[PDB]
Design a protein around this ligand. Structure first.
Ligand SMILES: NC(=O)C1=CN([C@@H]2O[C@H](COP(=O)(O)OP(=O)(O)OC[C@H]3O[C@@H](n4cnc5c(N)ncnc54)[C@H](OP(=O)(O)O)[C@@H]3O)[C@@H](O)[C@H]2O)C=CC1
Lengths: 499, 499, 499, 499
């Protein structure tokens, strides 16, 4: 006997033993009489196009794939529910926070960031942690990571970052000179780089890490009053990390470690769960906040902005067909129910457009009609019609223009947005020199102990040594700008690694 | 009050008079608070990204169209059923003929051939008359025309013929020289050309015209015995045609004449029906048939192969959304249930490849998952997976390979094809010189009367006059090769049209 | 002999009389031995898969189409040059206006609006008039119409308007009730509706109509000083219109009338030409302007803002292939070289997203790499990579991220945008009741005469009579609101039209 | 200093040091004035739509990816030439074999089989070795592997064999039960599984394995006489293999080992090359051959059929953009010049369709116009038109139909196929029970030595132990069917592995 994943087929048969197998048909429902030998004119004669059975099956085989995600390609999935435990209705009127005990069906997809579909699960890299809430106000996607911050703070640098984290456009190889040339020319990455090369840079699976909205969002209650908030969802299974040496063994020993961990976990009854907290800032607090409260490379400290609990995330169901229910999942940060809204964070302001845009390309123009993506607890009614692979009635014979004298859908004024006042030149403001070392200083000195600082420099140095020396020298300088001992340790190691 | 097709919204509002209009929502099921005014900064300021209501609608609007059909693009549609009235089980085991009084749902599409989506309905052309039978052995697609014959008899010429019946690649105009240079270089078109320009080139809507499968087909019975056969479905509303004068008036007074006519008829209860017949040829009749019995430019004369009634086609339902139910329909001649099989007709052999091919481009790799295309009265089970826009559970966790020891679907030996013997060189045989005049000469002299022969000549000269003289001179020779007087009448009129 | 268009195939042969015909191949360069007879086991046998020559040709004929344009699908095209005859460098620094005499290649496409690919040219509708300037600073796409104004002034209403002008979702029929239920619930359409049903609704070819930028734009000279402008290009051939009686005849006597007029003119040396003008409004004049200067239903009166001439548009070359050079054309209002910038028009602001979006869907992600959409006089260099149908070298091994220290492209600080100050609430302002009648009243009384007001009212009632009464009574009211005699005339004619 | 592959950017900058960086533009050729910060309303404001610099680049990033090959997805590419060195013109007339010293441009792609784009290069799995010859008569693709044989001999089993070798449809995990339940149910795979699990299952990169065409192919000479042949291209660098112990280390130390090995070689002038032989079997020797001469699971023994050299393949150029030259590379076995034809082999007959079918999906309808796919040593001319992404003239205004009296391309009679005579019932012949052991027993005993038999079993047992007992028992029995000591050694090691 083996682990439950290995026995998947074994159980599918036993869960079926009472029946007779189905008749094997074409895609058009036509029964197949033989599907192991091709129609030819003689035993050693050529193939006929009369063999549509072969063209039916082979044609689809040629169209099985679709494009992989441009980022967070290698992923695991599961399904469960969210349950409200505390009252934050003064902050949000969102139905998903209506009363205590209220449950909502969720979907979750974990992922790394850079590697393609076939890369390993135990590598250094941020981890995706995207959550989709099927509410009666339509879906709510909270597309988080395993970290509260990112490497940049303007969305126009994002593609360049990704290109600098993936393959060289000539050799198709991971290129240290691309990784660090960028990080050292853009020191706002110093915060998330110090998180990445810590121990939690390699989590021992998906169940032993926290999630974070990371973006500042906005909440709107039932009076029309607003506050800014951060979301935290912490692991009730405890932080637990792989060591560099173990992670490396499992990288060839079991490329699908985090995929097997999460499946077996739910299959053996061990349901992983997370605790959803928020931080709250008022609008006023947001004007006195020392840093930019909408700078993604900044955390709101806990002592000033403590964590308010909300509810629990629970994963208790596995997918049944991985493609249909995980690969085709499409999370939109623009999917926001009344009561939740975006902040002016530049990065988030870019993600509002990017995610729906790529889903029409990766999946199709009507990807929201795919079952896992559908807002199946909401009544979708509008004037949108047609498009490739149209799957419902196309809303039947309802008037497809607005406004109209025939009683098609109407707008719901209580769902209007919160009104905020802005003033300033319409112009590109240079955010590359916001504080880039203060919070990082705190992390290095007051969060880590001496052994963790020690490992931090060895993981950095074990990767920056391959860069050219003028890149090294420039990255080191950015580390001394955090704390002179931070850089002069890294440098001591580089001095060795350079022979 | 007006015709019912004009009162569509009127009735739609009436049938909804009681209940309340829906909530207008995004594609994501999020209600919108106002959809007549965009999100801007100030009453005379610019548009924001935040306005995801505008992007969501405008994005889908941008993605309404799909590539029209490459031929037969102007269509009308309707739905109904087929009912068996006579017993033809001694020839075919096809369940759809299992017993008298057994009904099977059908879907139909009437179309022209050459015009684009916005062309007029009352033009000289062949007409589509495609029928889809939703049977228990999977779907059966009888894709025919309003003719028993076609212009050519080898597929490799089909792209060329169509290009010659559409727009010049530089001027993008209808070109007579292209039309008649082909027709006069390929006289096998004499039989269908005669038909086209006579009275039945412009029918009075789609309810006053017959339907034929034109190809020869093979029927197989429960003993494995096989006969060839032709399909005729004759209109129970009577052959009735439009004049050239009345066609050219409606061509601008109501481009959608046919469309309207079918809709109104069904709505008022006036349900059209066709009587399905078959002809039956034995294998040993096929060896002594004077012509090639799979020649698509040939018919089976009635005196030697009489018509055998089978059942009725009946259309009693209008589409609800024309796009989802008529424009996304896909008919594949290769959708044949056990009992019905292809002949060796060179033209049918290419349609076995082409239709599923073009449907994967126009509609999508999983186009058989579109409801009106679904075989919803069979059980689709097989080892095809994935592909863009998957819409069912993708078959669940069922073993996806074959053979297996876990009881995935199995092959049904009774659905094996009938086995014929063939012997001959594997080469390209010349079918340009099979008898191209005999059956036409009969048609011109024995079928048409004096007045019809006169009108057949005028219509040909009326369209053949605009081609160059060397093209008119060759075409008239081919006509003179059918009957001398045929060419003399056409040639007399051309001498006049040429001033 | 016949007109030049009809003789296109004749002239192609003559221009090659001296050469030998090319060798016919597959798409793979493999010469074909026979393409008139299919590969079959014996003369009367089944077709083989080995027959790659059939599949290579039938595969590509199955993929010939693409999605037509969601609007303006029917169009004619030609190529020529824009030449500067006057100096407007004090207003705009654009290199297309640099000095008097400078020529820039252009590509124009004329169009109707609603009719699909096969509709007639001579129908009441607006006419597109798009102009693509190929500048050294990248393309400039002045996507104008044959009118200065439009039917709505908010992009969100745009999908609705269109859907009302096109076909009913259930009957696939032009629906009068959908046309006027819209127009009468949105009386900002009054101004452009009165343009459309007037004599200029049906131009006599594309050479006898003016072209307008319509939108207010922004120009920016070299000192950084900006103004607001309107682009009028007026026909040098004279305004010439068709009568309702002649336009209907041609609609079935030559559905491609304008397509044949544009080609024949050009072929005979009779090149059509336009005169480009600009209006100019200073930032301070805009503030006082009685209407909203960025309202798209409004014009700038000539006495207050008189036409400034700039240069000449000349069309002097027919497309050699219609598909690759006209069908594949793609104009993006967003294509604007330094010196030309958008105004805060709500409709234009929408059109900055719309056009690139749909061109990815209609033609593909790399649609700008089609030769006719190429900026083939500027040097494209950046950090965009890959995509479907990548056709050049893909910018080589160049560093693909920005910033970098390896001397890949750099930004150009002179090419920044003009900075404006805006201040206000971020919200959805209501523009529905901006002055809707004034400039229409002026048009009814002062621009038309006694006859023309008569014809305008017969045209409106001729089409409005088919709507429902409750939709008539409203439209007339909106017409009375322009002038009591306006809607009283319309109401008298409707009284008879309702028997 | 480092290897050449890491100094890629270093040499790019150095190869440009003279000239100045280009101006960073938009896709439209518009210069940008700042591409690091986004257009907002005040420094902490929201993003705008008229930030077309952000949209233009992100929308392309969202579309960087296409579908990955459905098999052989991991690969590495190189370009060089093929040179003739012997005279095989008595067998083939093909232009590539005209005379000694004739060179032709080639392009080669290496690959594994089951891994996706991210997988590792040093794993047990066959190796692709596809070769494209750009000859005057079009392109000649010789799509070979690193083995002479394959696991099956019918194409209707391919999608299933690949399904078993990839990921479970529910767990997305490699599934040894799927692997051996297939292999142990189809024992034809005995021959190739034994090659796979010997030392040549993991080569030391792509420069030390052989290439083979596996399928029997036809040659035809200038007289019209044919023979059946095999293609062998052996490595002039020497067979060299990785041990299970190092192959695993490198599968996490350097996932791209084989790709780096090839590039670094070429970049240092150590060019790899291969020697092209053929075997020859007349038609008479084919009738008496002990097995089926077209059975993909059977080799032709050297002693009866010796190798006949032909020439050399040499790789002396690296790609400049991997994506645009290696990922878009399209090989079609159907690309065959006159002189070379397919043999009746049941598996090759399916590849004649499958590849062009998947290249119209993966890349697009016009994937042959992509530079590296162009038959740029040959002149493409025909009557195929349009299609998505048509990039040249579209063959201009030439006539698009055939035959024509206007001098468009003609057929070339000498390029006709060789006529073979086939006689036999058209049906589905069973090929499961062709001799499944004979040539294997020869390999095991006579080709391997004592050591190599030992490791062959160990490699097999390590992977088979994870499969259920009932699947083990059936596998071993298929290894007892080759040789009792074969299934014995495997059963003694499985006894240990099962504790
Ligand atoms: N005859 C052929 O075309 C080939 C035959 N074989 C195997 O050889 C057996 C006998 O063929 P025969 O020609 O009579 O005897 P030969 O000894 O004449 O052929 C022996 C072949 O074995 C190949 N070989 C050596 N080690 C391995 C390995 N680990 N995995 C795969 N192939 C290997 C060599 O290929 P090289 O030295 O060319 O690299 C050599 O050419 C066949 O049954 C077949 O299994 C294998 C490859 C080609």
């Amino acid at each position: 006997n083996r682990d439950p994943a290995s026995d998947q087929m074994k159980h599918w048969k036993e869960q079926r033993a009472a029946q007779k197998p189905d008749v094997l048909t074409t895609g058009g429902g036509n029964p197949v009489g033989d599907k192991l030998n091709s129609l030819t004119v003689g035993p050693r004669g050529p193939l006929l196009v009369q063999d549509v059975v072969f063209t039916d099956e082979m044609a689809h085989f040629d169209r099985e794939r679709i494009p992989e995600r441009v980022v967070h390609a290698k992923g695991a999935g599961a399904f469960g529910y969210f349950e409200v435990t505390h009252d934050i209705t003064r902050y949000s009127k969102a139905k998903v926070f209506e009363h205590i005990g209220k449950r909502t069906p969720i979907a979750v997809r974990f992922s790394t960031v850079a590697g393609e579909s076939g890369s390993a699960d135990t590598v250094r890299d941020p981890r995706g942690f995207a959550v989709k809430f099927y509410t009666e106000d339509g879906n709510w996607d909270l597309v988080g990571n395993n970290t509260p911050i990112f490497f940049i703070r303007d969305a126009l640098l994002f593609p360049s970052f990704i290109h600098s984290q993936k393959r060289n456009p000539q050799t198709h190889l991971k290129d240290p000179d691309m990784v660090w040339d960028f990080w050292s020319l853009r020191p706002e990455s110093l915060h998330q780089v110090s998180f990445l090369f810590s121990d939690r840079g390699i989590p021992d699976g998906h169940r032993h890490m926290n999630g974070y909205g990371s973006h500042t969002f906005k909440l709107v209650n039932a009076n029309g009053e607003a506050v800014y908030c951060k979301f935290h969802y912490k692991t009730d299974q405890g932080i637990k990390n792989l060591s560099v040496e173990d992670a490396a063994r499992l990288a060839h020993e079991d490329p699908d470690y985090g995929l097997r961990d999460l499946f077996n976990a739910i299959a053996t009854g061990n349901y992983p769960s997370w605790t959803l907290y928020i931080q709250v800032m008022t609008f006023s607090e947001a004007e006195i906040f020392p840093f930019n409260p909408f700078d993604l490379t900044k955390v709101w400290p806990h002592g000033d902005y403590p964590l308010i609990p909300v509810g629990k995330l629970v994963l208790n169901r596995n997918p049944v067909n991985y493609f249909a229910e995980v690969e085709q999942l499409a999370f939109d940060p623009s999917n926001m129910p009344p009561g939740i809204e975006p902040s002016p964070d530049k990065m988030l302001q870019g993600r509002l457009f990017a995610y729906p845009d790529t889903h029409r390309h990766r999946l199709g123009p009507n990807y929201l009609q795919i079952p896992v993506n559908c807002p199946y607890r909401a009544r979708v009614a509008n004037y949108q019609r047609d498009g490739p692979m149209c799957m419902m009635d196309n809303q039947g014979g309802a008037p497809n223009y607005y406004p109209n004298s025939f009683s098609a859908p109407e707008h719901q004024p209580s769902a209007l947005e919160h009104r905020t006042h802005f003033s300033g030149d319409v112009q590109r403001f240079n955010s590359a020199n916001d504080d880039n070392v203060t919070q990082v200083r705190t992390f290095y000195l007051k969060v880590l102990n001496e052994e963790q600082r020690k490992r931090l420099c060895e993981n950095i140095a074990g990767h920056l040594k391959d860069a050219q020396l003028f890149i090294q020298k420039k990255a080191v300088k950015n580390f001394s700008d955090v704390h002179p001992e931070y850089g002069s340790r890294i440098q001591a190691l580089l001095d060795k690694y350079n022979e």
